[PDB]
Symmetry: C2
Subunit: 88 residues, 2 copies
């Protein structure tokens, strides 16, 4: 199974919490408030994608509202090469 990184930007608190809860239930590792990672085969990737699409299956109501999820395959080595920047 390939490793995936999942990043999201969801302004609605309710929808964001649904996404976080869903990804946790799928067994993905949470690495930041809005970032998860984990291994997914074809079946599990399809389930994740379908669930996330259902959560986003609505219309935006205000121009500054965002709902965006990016799922990208990565390798363990690439993840080890990551740079994380925070307050310092």
């Amino acid at each position: 199974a390939m490793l995936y990184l999942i990043f999201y930007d969801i302004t609605d608190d309710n929808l964001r919490n649904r996404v976080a809860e869903f990804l946790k239930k799928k067994g993905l590792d949470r690495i930041q408030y809005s970032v998860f990672m984990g291994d997914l085969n074809s079946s599990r990737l399809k389930d994740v994608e379908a669930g996330l699409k259902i959560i986003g299956n609505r219309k935006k109501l205000q121009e500054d509202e965002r709902f965006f999820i990016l799922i990208v395959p990565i390798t363990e080595n690439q993840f080890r090469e990551r740079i994380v920047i925070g307050y310092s």
Copy 2:
């Protein structure tokens, strides 16, 4: 030069705008409100990292404030394999 994906979660509007402006000036391609990508060699990666750290060189003032940037190497093929989910 390796391709990088840059995701961030920055609640302060001023700092977020400084990051977006900086990454644009560095020639990275913007792919979402808070996501960029592009090729960086060692020299250019170091400059990007140093600049982003300077922008984050302060102390958080309220518990729900976040400043997080993740830089990860990826390949063009991995990016072509990405899944993007939005409102639908």
